[PDB]
């Protein structure tokens, strides 16, 4: 009942629709306590 706590993944090109490897990104952000150093792009138009 001792267990080494990790278990390495197995990813072969033969596996079914579940076992296979999927990459993840989480755009985590912690919000609204400080001055801004990022926003999205501020699109613009021709000068009449």
């Amino acid at each position: 009942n001792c267990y080494f706590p990790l278990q390495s993944y197995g990813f072969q090109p033969t596996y079914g629709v579940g076992y296979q490897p999927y990459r993840v990104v989480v755009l985590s952000f912690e919000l609204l306590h400080a001055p801004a150093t990022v926003c999205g792009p501020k699109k613009s138009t021709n000068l009449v």
């Binding site: 400080a34 001055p35 801004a36 150093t37």
Partner: protein, 48 residues
């Protein structure tokens, strides 16, 4: 340091004087603004 933004304004001007801070007048232009957020309580320079 204003509401989480640091600001530098500066000048360089030519002189000919021996001793004291030259009597006369010029303004400083704003050079750079940075959103650093830190508490500047105190400071030091850097010699070479």
């Amino acid at each position: 340091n204003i509401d989480g933004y640091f600001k530098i304004y500066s000048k360089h001007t030519p002189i000919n004087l021996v001793r004291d801070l030259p009597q006369g007048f010029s303004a400083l232009e704003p050079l750079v603004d940075l959103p650093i957020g830190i508490n500047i309580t105190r400071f030091q320079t850097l010699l070479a």
